[PDB]
């Protein structure tokens, strides 16, 4: 076991090849499957796992009632092997949490699970499943984190957290964590920015985060930083708007695009020089569909011209959160960091006539060989017996 | 693999950070979950496990009928990873038992499971799952033990057992066990004391046990001893009464507090010099709620003044047994022994209109970083389909 | 990994301490548990497992219908950890089989699973789960074997098989197996003897088998042999008759006791010089109850006087097959071979108004410390929802 | 870990000894079992696994509806230990796929899972579960592969794929894969041949594939090649026709036998000089029954005379796909490559009045010791509760 270097560059990719699909809600129709949301993938040097926040209940059970609510004392962070349904019989317990992050530094797992009341939430940090540190809300307004993987470089793992209104300017801090212990932190000087649910990846020894602006931006804000938490911020300039909801594609902005900027969805993007791989919903108003768009100058250009589009989920099928995850050369044997992504396909409320809300997941990896667009939807036919 | 030293002191702590929550009864509403009671946690140098006494039946099944009864030939001691529901598909069989203890000496697991009729019960000792010794009732009145973890120091593990009335003076013996073999035992000279269900931990090479007085004490009795079974006894003097039921807090006693002293609940406390961390119910009459109270002079002072209170379970929510467990530096890499505790949240009879009784569990670990009180209740809505 | 020596003597024992109980049929009331019969235990140098012949169906399912039938193409030999219920989610597949044996030689598992039609059955031998040899029926009348563990000594494992009438004289052959390969075999010259379902154990470098006489003996026949298959035969002389059905205890015979000698039950006994540990049913006509009886001269004496009786299963509770299993010093660290036994508790047909038949299991190990009799019954209340 | 040599010859065999039977559909009657088809076995140097294409649904669940359809975005390739039912609680996720192959090169697993629309399918190659390469349809007509194990020799694994009409001449390419990376490929010059679902095995450092002619041949086509993809092609000449449907046995052809040549079934055969071990259906019109036939000159002779027939599945019981798999000497310790085969027993549509289609599996290994014919059918009684 050797700590991840995190010193190679992102691998340029031409398309996305399908990696996993769990069919959790269909299997959950009769079988014993957790009610979950906020799934995300993270890999160790040996295996890849699906992390998820359960609601402490099973599908098609009465306790799945009201699971449109995001936070409660019953939600717990657990994990299972990629592609497998999150079941009590195959899942590892990670932490009690309604907001989370996780990553492997090359030696052991780091987990961050937030509980503590909305009035004063506390993040529980675990290293190899043992509590190693905590950090409590400093704004008393729903302390919250990535809902995707943290990024690790040379024995250090890095993440972001938000505390404050999701309806206005809040406070965002970046953390450097070593062996589950917070080593240093910094408050961003980001007036008029909004950061939530960052999807972060390492690239050439530094970390880049693409996040969600729930306040007033339909493009995605980003933050990049070195190991000392020296930061840079901005918004993706491409007119290929990445958030949901959003306007129809047009001339973009290097600042928050106010039109349809309120609310949003967790998402991701990969920066390549002036170019960007953008993952987004197909519908501009609800989380339907999913597509990957290559915009060769979208990081810095405000135009709406792109070069490649790959279908991921059909436009009439439900989608949801999406996030980045990487496979390090220590795992793959490649000479660069492999970009991958996962997609949450949310079924039930608020779009469907159920008493419950849960998601399935699909994942893809970036390749330079041939790929094809298709639709890999959840595919469950709702409602269920419980309704 | 190296035997646990057990030679460092307890880590002083400022609050308790949540470690696990299993939601067993809610998940058990439809899924396959054991009917259990008397859960407790114990860790090896590599992992932490939840031990429990099953009743040999599943939740929401007819065989869960009458599970308010504590002893029967169907109850068995099994274990699973922390935070996971006790299921037949993820649980390791330990012993046939209606009273139990368990611990890791640094090399392998020691288990103690009692069966034998109330007229003549026999404790089955297992080391690495192999029977290594037995000890039979010497008073012919329900031989019984900790229902929490034993304590290990330098290759020796130590525990307590009771035989006799729970309605009056009984007989209590302390045991030194090495590799599952009883090495030495001693009968306490404890007239007017009552010891049941001790929660024991090691501290600076000696073991301290905080127990339950079911006869006539609403404060908790304690016993401390060295490796040779040289013992000291007393009651926690703090007016913060730790047992349940109990009187309202007032001036305490260094002897058994007779007021509301009958009956009780398994509990724990951590001794720090003259100070004590007290875990107790919030209601004085039924096992509702749970709270942690720091009484800087409560071990030896009879006053009711305390310095810190941390909410654990809301006052209107059901609780139950609680017990100590430790994480040794051999596991954590710390330079002191980490205090933790678990809480059993009993649902069903006798408080609720069910045919069955079972519990879920939550656990916390002591830290010096920021924490917050909240309520982490079982959260199942009873009754169930079976009723 | 070192091959088992098998060169120490049996450990003298004073009582039997309970080792495992699975509660399979009660748990199977709702949960997913195999329909099984003929369970038996065998240990490796690291773990102990329950082997069993499934009927390829689950409890409380329509496919459990008619499972009173012993042989069919759907029965398979599988195994799980001791004490755990045989479930599709925790069970290892061993072989397709309606008659079986298994053992560990110190290096890997040997399995023997018989299929082939009653007209021509074929035993499939597996070593580390890989087919290594076969042997087909030589009498074309239900080739069958121990239904308990084989015995291993210095890299060789030994067993017995029967082919022919169970209503009269049949043919019995002893096998020496090395790494799953039959090395040598011999046909017994046993006129007027009947051998079925031998429970075999090693003792001081030789193997002893206690079996079932289904033809005309209510005492148990035995066979002992060295590694070259040089054999000795006889019947246990004790008037403590070990088979079921059987007469009331009286003066025994060193030959087959004709009274109530027809039919029988798989059983076991441990030979100690002229003494014997006898396990038997409590009822003389049906498989109810179970008890352990020490008859200090019962191997060679025809009297009915015994010294010790230990209750195992109450007289009004259903029992069934019983068999020997040993724990070798290579596993325990003892200086002798530990005698243990298991009991099958058959529920359903033919004694109960069900459509199905299945069993649970209990097991005990011999000790010289204090023990107690009790009753550890199956405890399920029949019939079930399927009936 | 050492790469498989693949340099020994096939072991001559006299009969087939039963190796596994999963009873998946019967167990699935109540328990949680995947809807699957196209099962196949492949072994590593340590274990043997059942691979299968799920339909992302469970038996006796509404989502099993319409599972007669072969391709959809919900089907995924997963695996479990041999003999165990494919369940979400014991199955490893492999790939998203409606057509598949898998094999172990001695070091790690190679998986090939095809998705991409019928208009442009993409094969996802995984090595140790990590995507290593892709190949997309070149004829835009359902890119498809073996549905059985690939063959590995000296660090290289080899397989076949088809693209084009199954109603006429299509295009077939052979691939050499090293560590999950396609190293070289070649298009066959096979006018008037048709290759689908090849069952491939290594033999004396070269690979032989026996396949399915869905266009116009009732005998099976074959392809053999060395490591450089230098190929030879033909049809099995034996009048023992191997495909289904097929004519009654008569004088065969070394070319495609046009009579009843349309449609077919995945199958296998083992070439031994001029001889052949033929596995086939018992019915000539539907996939009923299964039998093994030794035709000592059937590879090159057009006659219908054979020497050995072994019953595998009774003529009135449902069967389906069959395929080859081998156990290498690296696993067995033998001095030759062991021939084995598996059989899929399809239950439900289109032969039975259900809403669903799924299969169980049986497997056998070639031996020179005594064997017997019998019938090992699926044995489930349909329809089920869902219908
Ligand atoms: C998922 O959660 C939903 C939210 O709680 C549940 O809906 C709730 O169901 C409860 C119970 O039926 C209901 O409570 C009240 O309102 C009822 C009318 O809507 C009313 O009938 C109830 O009271 C009457 O009956 C009781 C008992 O006889 C009397 O004591 C009362 O005096 C009165 O006569 C009660 O006032 C909620 O209204 C309802 N909520 C919503 C939003 O609809 C779902 O049932 C639940 N699903 C599952 C599967 O558990
Ligand atoms: C959990 O255990 C509880 C305790 O055993 C069960 O309650 C028991 O249910 C039984 C069976 O119904 C019942 O037995 C007797 O009393 C009945 C009235 O209470 C009476 O009706 C029964 O006898 C009558 O019917 C039988 C059959 O027709 C006749 O042979 C009799 O002559 C008579 O006509 C019988 O006397 C217990 O009373 C009852 N116990 C309690 C404490 O209520 C629960 O049913 C059980 N739950 C589950 C889900 O299994
Ligand atoms: C476990 O297995 C048992 C043994 O098979 C089952 O019992 C069997 O149930 C079948 C089906 O009901 C039954 O078959 C015949 O006999 C019936 C009377 O006993 C008779 O009614 C049946 O035929 C009639 O109905 C059919 C359909 O309408 C007509 O085609 C016929 O012409 C006739 O009108 C049929 O002759 C067996 O008798 C019965 N066996 C025994 C021993 O009782 C159990 O049902 C089964 N349990 C489960 C849960 O599967
Ligand atoms: C497995 O899949 C099968 C294929 O989809 C299902 O069969 C389908 O069931 C649906 C729903 O019942 C049915 O849809 C239509 O046709 C019905 C008559 O066959 C018709 O009654 C339906 O419409 C009527 O009712 C609706 C609602 O009240 C109205 O809006 C309509 O205007 C009309 O009044 C509808 O047109 C399919 O016909 C049917 N398909 C087949 C091939 O039979 C199975 O139900 C399914 N099984 C399970 C367990 O899910
Ligand atoms: C990446 O990290 C490794 C391991 O520390 C180091 O040896 C190597 O120089 C780094 N590679 C590059 C290209 O900087
Ligand atoms: C604790 O135990 C270790 C291991 O035996 C020993 O080396 C060390 O001296 C002890 N530490 C203290 C502080 O006594
Ligand atoms: C038992 O076997 C061991 C291992 O082969 C051998 O060394 C030893 O001499 C034997 N013991 C006795 C008492 O014969
Ligand atoms: C088979 O392969 C091994 C390993 O590479 C080699 O040493 C051996 O010569 C080969 N055997 C034969 C018979 O060619
Ligand atoms: Ca937005
Ligand atoms: Ca652009
Ligand atoms: Ca269930
Ligand atoms: Ca008390
Ligand atoms: Ca005080
Ligand atoms: Ca007899
Ligand atoms: Ca006697
Ligand atoms: Ca179920
Ligand atoms: Ca054909
Ligand atoms: Ca021929």
Instruction: Show the 3-state SS of D282-296.
Output: CCCCCCEEEEEEEEC
* Distance (Å) of CA C73 to CA A165, B236, D81, D125, D279: 66, 67, 20, 37, 20
Sheet holding A92-96, edge to edge: A34-43, A48-58, A76-81, A92-96
Single out the residue of A151, A142, A147, A139 nearest to residue A106, CA to CA. Answer: A151
Which residue's CA lies nearest to atom 2 of ligand 7?
C5
Q: C228 in contact with B at a CB cutoff of 8 Å?
A: no
Distances in whole angstroms, Cα of residue A301 to Cα of each of A250, A271, A296, C217, D206: 12, 13, 9, 95, 56
Q: H or E stretch including D113?
A: strand D109-115
- Residue A154 in contact with residue A8, Cβ under 8 Å? no
Search chain B and give the residue with CA nearest C326.
B130
Task: Kindly name the residue from A32, A70, A133, A249 that is annotated as catalytic.
Answer: A70
Write out the H or E segment, with its range, that includes residue C157: strand C156-163
Residue D139 Cα, gap to closest chain C Cα (Å): 42
Residues whose CB is less than 8 angstroms from the CB of residue C270 and which lie 6 or more positions away in sequence, other chains included = C10, C201, C276, C277, C324, C339, C366
Instruction: Please name the residues in contact with A387: beta carbons below 8 A apart, sequence gap of 6 or more.
Output: A353, A354, A355
Q: Is residue A23 helix, strand or coil? A: coil
- Interatomic CA distance for residues A76 and A94, integer angstroms: 8
Residue in A1, A3, A4, A5 to alter for ligand 5 test, most ligand atoms within 8 A of Cβ = A5
Structure tokens at D30: 């109540």
Question: Under the phi-then-psi rule, with left for phi > 0, alpha for psi from -120 to 50, and beta for the rest, what region is C62?
Answer: alpha
The three-class DSSP label of residue A63 is: helix
Q: Which range of residues forms the domain containing residue B100?
A: 1-387
How many whole angstroms separate alpha carbon C187 and alpha carbon C189? 7
Q: Checking phi first, is residue D126 left (phi over 0); if not, alpha (psi -120 to 50) or beta? A: beta
DSSP D27: H
Residue D26's H or E segment, with its range, is helix D24-27
Query: Is the CB of B23 less than 8 angstroms away from the CB of A96?
Result: no
What is the spatial order of strands in the sheet that D34-43 belongs to?
D34-43, D48-58, D76-81, D92-96
Backbone angles phi, psi at A57, to 5 degrees: -150, 165
Q: Is D64 helix (H, G, I), strand (E, B) or coil?
A: helix
Entry resolution in angstroms? 2.9
How many other CB atoms are there within 10 angstroms of residue B231's CB atom? 18
| Touching chains, C (3+ CB pairs < 8 A) | B, D
CA distance A298 to A274: 7
Asked if residues C214 and C338 have their Cβ atoms less than 8 Å apart, the reply is no
Q: Which of B44, B49, B43, B6 is nearest to B155 (CA)?
A: B6
Residues A20, A363 contacting (CB under 8 angstroms): yes
CA-based radius of gyration for chain A: 19
DSSP 8-state assignment for residue B220? P
Cis check: omega of the bond before D160, within 30 degrees of 0? no
Q: Are D4 and D44 in contact (CB under 8 A)?
A: no
Tokens of D65: 């509806």
CA A129 – CA A149 distance, rounded (Å): 16
Decide the pairing of beta strands B122-127 and B109-115.
Answer: antiparallel
Residues B231 and B321: their CA atoms lie apart, in Å, by: 25
Name the burial class of residue B46, with classes exposed (0-12), middle (13-18) and buried (19+) by CB atoms within 10 angstroms of its CB.
Answer: exposed
Listed in sequence order, the residues at least 6 apart from B44 whose beta carbon sits closer than 8 Å to its beta carbon are B104, B109, B331
Q: Measure CA of the first residue to CA of the last residue in chain B; give whole Å.
A: 48
Instruction: Please say whether the dihedral angle defined by the alpha carbons of residues D46, D50, D55 and D60, taken in this order, is positive or negative.
Output: negative
Query: CA angle at residue D211 from D210 to D212, to 5 degrees?
Result: 150
Q: d(Cα C343, Cα C365) in Å, to the nearest integer?
A: 12
Task: Say how many C-beta atoms besides its own lie within 10 A of residue D298's C-beta.
Answer: 30
Residue A66's nearest CA partner among A55, A80, A54, A79 is A55
Under 8 Å CB pairs connecting chains A and B tally to 110
Q: Are D61 and A29 in contact (CB < 8 Å)?
A: yes
What contacts 24+ positions apart, CB below 8 Å, involve D183-191? D183/D156, D184/D228, D184/D229, D185/D229, D186/D229, D186/D231, D188/D223, D188/D231, D188/D233, D190/D233
Closest CA to A53 of A291, A353, A361: A361
CA A149 to chain centre: 7
Chain D residue with the nearest C-alpha to that of A50: D93
CB proximity list for A104: less than 8 A, separation 6 or greater: A4, A42, A43, A44, A45, A110, A152
Cα–Cα distance list, C257 to B159, C217, C261 (Å)? 52, 5, 6
Query: Measured between CB atoms, which of D91, D93, D120 is closest to A20?
Result: D93
Residues in chain A: 387
Q: Do residues D309 and D321 touch, judged by C-beta distance below 8 A?
A: no
Closest Cα in chain B to C379? B74
Starting from the CA of residue B237, give the closest ligand: 13
Q: Can you tell me whether residue D359 is helix, strand or coil?
A: strand
Q: And the tokens for C130? A: 């890989």
Tell me if residue A352 falls in helix, strand or coil.
coil
Q: What number of CA atoms fall less than 13 Å from residue A230's CA on the CB side?
A: 4
Q: Strand D275-280 and strand D269-272: pairing? A: antiparallel
| Phi then psi dihedrals of residue C64, to 5 deg | -80, 0
How far away, in angstroms, is D381 Cα from ligand 3 center?
A: 13
Under 8 Å CB-to-CB from A23, ≥6 apart: which residues?
A85, A360, A378, A379, D54, D56, D57, D74, D76
Q: How far is CA A85 from CA A33, A58, C204, D311, in A?
A: 7, 12, 52, 39
What's the distance, CA B273 to chain centroid?
22
Q: What is the CA angle B309-B350-C383, rounded to 5? A: 135
Residue A340: half-sphere exposure toward Cβ, Cα within 13 Å:
25
The alpha carbon dihedral of B189, B195, B196, B199 has a sign of: negative
CB atoms within 10 A of CB D250: 13
- Whether the link from the prior residue into D148 is cis, omega within 30° of 0, is no
Nearest CA to ligand 7 atom 5: C5
What does the DSSP 8-state code read for residue A169? -
Enumerate the β-bridge partners of residue B81.
B49
Instruction: For residue B14, give the 3-state DSSP assignment.
Output: coil
Report CA dihedral (B300, B303, B308, B312) to the nearest 10 degrees. 90
Residues β-bridged to residue A21: A362
Q: Copy the structure tokens of residue C244.
A: 């079921």
* Dmax (CA) of chain D: 53
Cβ–Cβ below 8 Å for C73 and D27: no
The two tokens of residue B324 are: 């100590």
Q: How far is CA B337 from CA B9, B279, B331, D175, in A?
A: 6, 18, 10, 59
Contact A222, A206 (CB under 8 A): no
Residue A54's closest CA among A41, A73, A82, A30? A73
Distance between CA atoms of A337 and A5, rounded to whole angstroms?
10
Does residue B104 belong to the interface with chain A, where contact is any CB pair within 8 Å?
Answer: no
**Is-contact D243 D219, C-beta < 8 A?**
yes
Q: Does B80 touch chain C if contact means CB atoms closer than 8 Å?
A: no
CA distances for B297 relative to A77, B254, B274, angstroms:
38, 13, 5
**DSSP for A217-255?**
-SSPEEEEE-TT--EEEEE---SS--SSS-PPS-S--SS
Half-sphere exposure of C112 (CA within 13 A, CB side): 34
Strand residues in D149-296 grouped as ranges (E): 151-153, 156-163, 171-178, 181-187, 196-203, 206-212, 221-225, 231-235, 269-272, 275-280, 288-295
Residue having the nearest C-alpha atom to atom 6 of ligand 1: A65
Chains touching D (at least 3 CB pairs under 8 A) are: A, C
Give CA–CA dist A186/A173, Å, rounded.
5
Which helix (H) or strand (E) segment holds residue C206: the answer is: strand C206-212
What tokens appear for B4 in the block? 């646990």
CA–CA gap between residue B157 and residue B176 (Å, rounded): 6
- Residue B24's φ and ψ, nearest 5 degrees, are -60, -45
Dump the DSSP string for C15-60. Answer: EEEEEEE--HHHHTTTS--EEEEEEEEEE-SS-EEEEEEEEEEETT
Is the Cβ–Cβ distance between D169 and D215 less than 8 Å? Answer: yes
C-alpha distances in Å from residue D204, one per residue of D9, D153, D336: 5, 9, 9
Residue B7 near ligand 6, beta carbon < 6 Å: yes
Closest-lying ligand to the alpha carbon of B274? Answer: 13
Q: Is the CB of D5 under 6 A from ligand 8?
A: yes
A115 and B90 within 8 Å at the Cβ level: the answer is no
Using CA atoms, how far apart are residues C302 and D90, in angstroms rounded to an integer? 54
Residue A280's DSSP bridge partners are A291
Q: Which residues contact D255 (CB under 8 A, 6 or more apart)?
A: D192, D217, D235
How many helices and strands (H and E) does chain C possess? 2, 24
* Ligand 4 contacts CB of residue D383 (under 6 A): no
Q: Is C70 a catalytic residue?
A: yes
Query: How distant is the alpha carbon of residue B176 from its chain centre?
Result: 19
Q: Which residue has the tokens 């995984």?
A: D126
B49 is in an annotated binding site: no
Bridge partners (DSSP) of residue A199 are: A210
| Residue D227 structure tokens | 């490591």
> Smallest Cα–Cα separation from C149: which of C83, C101, C117, C204?
C101
Q: How do the residues of chain D divide into helix, strand and coil, expressed in percent and rounded to 5?
A: 5, 45, 50
Structure tokens at C154: 């210095």
Name the residue of chain A whose CA is nearest to D181's CA.
A369
Ligand 5 pocket residues where CB is under 6 Å: A 5, 7
CA–CA gap between residue B230 and residue C228 (Å, rounded):
58
The two three-digit tokens of residue D14, written as one number: 């006299």
D56 at interface of A, judged by CB pairs closer than 8 A: yes
**DSSP symbol at C236:** -
Which is nearest to B199 in space by CA: B268, B153, B144, B145? B268
**Ligand 8, atom 6: nearest CA belongs to which residue?**
D5
Query: How many domains are contained in chain C?
Result: 1
Q: Are D117 and D236 in contact (CB under 8 A)?
A: no
Distances (CA, A) of C293 to A230, B2, C250, C297, C309: 80, 43, 15, 12, 4
- Could you say which DSSP state residue C11 is in? P
Q: For residue C69, give every residue at least 6 positions away whose Cβ sits within 8 Å of its Cβ, in sequence order, or none.
A: none
Biggest CA–CA distance in chain C, Å, is 53
Do residues A227 and A267 make contact, with C-beta atoms less than 8 angstroms apart? no
For residue D156, the cross-strand partners are D153
């Amino acid at each position: 076991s050797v700590k991840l270097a995190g010193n190679s560059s992102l691998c340029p990719v031409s398309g996305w090849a399908i990696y996993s699909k769990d069919n959790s809600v269909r299997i959950g129709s009769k079988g014993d499957v957790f009610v979950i949301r906020e799934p995300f993938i993270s890999c160790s040097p040996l295996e890849c796992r699906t992390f998820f926040l359960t609601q402490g209940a099973l599908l098609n059970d009465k306790h799945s009632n009201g699971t449109i609510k995001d936070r409660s004392p019953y939600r717990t962070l657990m994990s299972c092997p990629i592609g497998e349904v999150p079941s009590p019989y195959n899942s590892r317990f990670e932490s009690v949490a309604w907001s989370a992050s996780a990553c492997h530094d090359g030696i052991n797992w780091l987990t961050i699970g937030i509980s503590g009341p909305d009035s004063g939430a506390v993040a529980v940090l675990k290293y190899n499943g043992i509590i190693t540190d905590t950090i409590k809300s400093w704004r008393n307004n729903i302390l919250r984190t990535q809902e995707s993987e943290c990024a690790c470089v040379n024995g250090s793992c890095f993440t972001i957290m938000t505390d404050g209104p999701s309806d206005g300017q809040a406070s965002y801090k970046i953390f450097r964590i070593e062996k589950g212990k917070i080593i240093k932190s910094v408050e961003m000087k980001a007036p008029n920015y909004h950061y939530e649910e960052c999807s972060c990846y390492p690239d050439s020894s530094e970390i880049t985060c693409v996040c969600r602006d729930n306040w007033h931006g339909s493009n995605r804000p980003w933050v990049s930083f070195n190991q000392n938490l020296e930061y840079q911020m901005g918004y993706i300039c491409s007119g290929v708007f990445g958030d949901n909801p959003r306007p129809n594609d047009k001339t973009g902005s290097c600042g928050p695009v106010s039109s349809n900027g309120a609310n949003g969805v967790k998402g991701f993007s990969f920066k390549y020089g002036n170019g960007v791989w953008i993952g987004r919903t197909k519908s501009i108003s609800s989380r339907k569909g999913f597509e990957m768009i290559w915009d060769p100058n979208g990081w810095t250009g405000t135009d709406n011209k792109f070069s490649i589009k790959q279908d991921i989920v059909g436009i009439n099928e439900w989608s949801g959160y999406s996030g980045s995850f990487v496979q390090h050369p220590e795992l793959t044997g490649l000479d660069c960091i492999r970009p991958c992504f996962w997609v949450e396909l949310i079924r039930g409320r608020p779009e469907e006539n159920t008493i419950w809300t849960s998601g399935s997941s699909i994942s893809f990896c970036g390749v330079n060989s041939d790929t094809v667009g298709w639709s890999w939807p959840d595919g469950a036919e709702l409602p269920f017996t419980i309704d």
